[PDB]
Amino acid sequence: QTLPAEGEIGLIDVGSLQLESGAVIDDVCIAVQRWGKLSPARDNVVVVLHALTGDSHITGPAGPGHPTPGWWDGVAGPGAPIDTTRWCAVATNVLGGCRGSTGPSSLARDGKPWGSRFPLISIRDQVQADVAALAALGITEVAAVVGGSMGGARALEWVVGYPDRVRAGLLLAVGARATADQIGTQTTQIAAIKADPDWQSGDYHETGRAPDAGLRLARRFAHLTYRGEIELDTRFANHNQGNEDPTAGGRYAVQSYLEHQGDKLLSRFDAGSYVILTEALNSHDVGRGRGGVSAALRACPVPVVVGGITSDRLYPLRLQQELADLLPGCAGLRVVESVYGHDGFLVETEAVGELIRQTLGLAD
Amino acid sequence: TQTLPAEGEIGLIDVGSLQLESGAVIDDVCIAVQRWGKLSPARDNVVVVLHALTGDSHITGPAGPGHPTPGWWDGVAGPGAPIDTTRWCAVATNVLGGCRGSTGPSSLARDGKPWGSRFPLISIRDQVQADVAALAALGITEVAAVVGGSMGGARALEWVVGYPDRVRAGLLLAVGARATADQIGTQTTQIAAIKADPDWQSGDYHETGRAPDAGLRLARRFAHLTYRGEIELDTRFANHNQGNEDPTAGGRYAVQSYLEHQGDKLLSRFDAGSYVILTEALNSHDVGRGRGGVSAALRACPVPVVVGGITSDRLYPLRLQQELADLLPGCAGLRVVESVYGHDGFLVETEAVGELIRQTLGLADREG
Ligand SMILES: CC(C)(COP(=O)(O)OP(=O)(O)OC[C@H]1O[C@@H](n2cnc3c(N)ncnc32)[C@H](O)[C@@H]1OP(=O)(O)O)[C@@H](O)C(=O)NCCC(=O)NCCS
Ligand SMILES: CC(C)(COP(=O)(O)OP(=O)(O)OC[C@H]1O[C@@H](n2cnc3c(N)ncnc32)[C@H](O)[C@@H]1OP(=O)(O)O)[C@@H](O)C(=O)NCCC(=O)NCCS
After folding, report:
1. Is the Cβ–Cβ distance between A20 and A122 less than 8 Å?
2. What residues does the AB hydrolase-1 domain cover (chain A)?
3. Minimum distance, in Å, between the CA of residue A229 and any CA atom of chain B
């Protein structure tokens, strides 16, 4: 198989995939998009790994086929952090997603949506799908892997599980494993979607009713863990939305901001994928079956750049400090100044650009 | 005549009809009250204890008839305790709009059926007016001090600011001058989680056999997270599984099982309707409303106060207490409590919170 036309969308059939749990999901497709020109040696691939609700559209404007622009708009191109004049930015839709790759909303063999029959996946299963997707194109080793959040967890299992198939990695706003705080809010986000009457045990697809209310609830609660406490108060405080009265049907500024944030997600994301991908986040743990977190990291030789956000409330700075101390390929923690919490790795263009540019230098 | 209830008993004080800040009127308001210790000769030793969102008048004592769970500050009032009952009379009420004794959404109105969707939104200032009206109904017009945390701290704040001449001192724990954006964000969403429950029935579920249990449990699980510290949880539960359950095969995580138990535990002692009404009184908390702003209102309050905050508080960060301490002239300086239990530290650190209460009562003595 060949890479899709630069910019366009493409599907890569990797066949059956045996998961860490033993389950076997067959006829697996992996959507992918590429910016940049593949090298004659196929050795300049920079794999960009997206987060929970992201997809393969990492950069570019909106329009046909893409409701919203890329989540890292401007990270790939001439002179950009990932210089496409000499690098090949390859992004894929994670396994279990809903933007082209096999997931709960995809159809199985019986001609009906996977739904509740979709097997539970892990971060290592998402990585095996990406690695297999690249193999289907003749790419065994990639120059670097970069991602934040789930994308960071995907980049951590890539450098630890396949150290010889990658030359460098950028771990952004992620930890070596899921924390109690992350699982607590994420398992409750799931319970919010599952308590919606229209969830229908996960087989709501093609029935007309979906768990919209539950999905908005989960997204609103999650968005709070993405932002910084001070940034929210400084920006919204307790002000009212316009001239509304929260005492008699109005809304607060922050309340109107969260409802919009959940509305943006309903029009593009599927609840089933939100559950499956969140359950994969909960299972994140680089030390499982490797002798613990410390052993797995001490035994990883891949050179990596670790970045952490100060005001991050979902992935506190202490987690990245642990990663940098234990990974021998990492000099030290690379703090990203930002007041926007976890969203810092999405908004701090210049700060994140420096970490990417440092990561590609190690790949050289 | 309306009298205080016996120590350990519950009393139902009638205050008649009250007019809320919004203009609405609440008829036949009933406020539940509990006492600890005798009144002094001049009746000048009343220490009002104001509970938090899901609290009640059972501030101390074991479980027994009418009190399934011990007091939220077990050991805070009594002989030699922080509120030494040999000197002070600990008076605690159930907040207006509560489900735990006083008039609220679950209480029956005049037409015979519950208030429900007919209960008007109340502000923190409305809850203070009711408590002051309750004490007045008995005959108390001046208290020695007010103490509370969270919503209890908000009630205490509006008390010293609104009735400076009828209170000698106050203790403000883990609270801010006004509701923050992060607080209003999660709290409005919690309200939305209860109303999205198909059994909410616009709030008129009380006499239908159905209740929004799913929504309330969800709102509580999210709220409990904001009450704890990040490091506390990871050290306690990490990513461990619950018992022998396996998340890979539909099992639960340790922290997941813990949060579920918190929802159920509140689910069997609290009313969803009250949760919504009280949660929205928190949203409207703004000591500066109608007073020229936060700084003006606090600058004008001369009551001596003790302000304390928790280091790991994630819902009411330390910066909020620091602001209160800086704007209130009656405060000598922020008192920092070192705890790992986040916002819940004001309930757990009974030794560090005990001293702040003793400092507050010391100011009440000096001012008397
Ligand atoms: C884009 C993002 C990542 C960071 O960008 P940002 O600079 O912080 O932008 P903001 O969200 O603060 O504000 C922009 C939007 O909020 C809207 N908004 C702001 N205040 C509002 C209000 N009071 N009422 C309604 N909408 C409001 C703006 O209109 C704008 O809407 P738009 O999407 O149509 O352009 C973040 O905003 C987002 O959308 N999601 C973050 C969560 C996420 O992606 N998580 C997965 C990665 S781990
Ligand atoms: C009272 C309170 C502060 C207790 O805090 P704590 O003393 O530090 O102890 P915890 O509640 O965190 O843990 C003990 C309880 O959790 C349970 N628990 C612990 N681990 C568990 C697990 N893995 N799975 C299930 N349940 C678990 C224990 O069995 C115990 O149950 P119990 O409530 O019947 O006693 C608080 O947790 C509570 O129950 N209510 C507080 C109400 C409130 O609004 N607080 C904030 C002020 S508004």
Report:
1. yes
2. 44-348
3. 6
SS3 A253: helix
Going from the Cα of A68 to the center of ligand 1, the distance in angstroms, rounded, reads: 12
Q: Domains in chain A and their CATH numbers?
A: 10-178+285-363 (3.40.50.1820), 182-280 (1.10.1740.110)
The answer to whether the beta carbons of residues B170 and B303 sit under 8 Å apart is: yes
Q: Does the distance separating the beta carbons of A180 and B255 come in below 8 Å?
A: yes
Strands of chain A, DSSP E? 10-18, 24-35, 45-49, 76-77, 82-83, 88-92, 142-148, 166-172, 304-309, 334-336
Q: How far apart are CA B14 and CA B28, in angstroms?
A: 7
Could you give the CA distance from residue A313 to residue A225 in angstroms, rounded to a whole number? 6
Resolution in A: 2.7
| Facing A232 at nearest CB: one of B181, B196, B217 | B181
Closest atom, ligand 2, to C-alpha of B54: 44
State yes or no: is A125 an active-site residue.
Answer: no
Q: Which of A314, A311, A73, A80 is nearest to A184 (CA)?
A: A314
3-state secondary structure chain B: CCCCCCCCCCEEEEEEEEECCCCCEEEEEEEEEEEECCCCCCCCCEEEEECCCCCCCCCCCCCECCECCCCCCCCCEECCCCEECCCCEEEEECCCCCCCCCCCCCCECCCCCECHHHCCCCCHHHHHHHHHHHHHHHCCCCEEEEEEECHHHHHHHHHHHHCHHHEEEEEEECCCCECCHHHHHHHHHHHHHHHCCCCCHHHCCCCCCCCCHHHHHHHHHHHHHHCCCHHHHHHHCCCCECCCCCHHHCCCEHHHHHHHHHHHHHHCCCCHHHHHHHHHHHHCCECCCCCCCHHHHHHCCCCCEEEEEECCCCCCCHHHHHHHHHHCCCCCCCEEECCCCHHHHHHHCHHHHHHHHHHHHHHHHHHC
Using what technique was this structure determined? X-ray
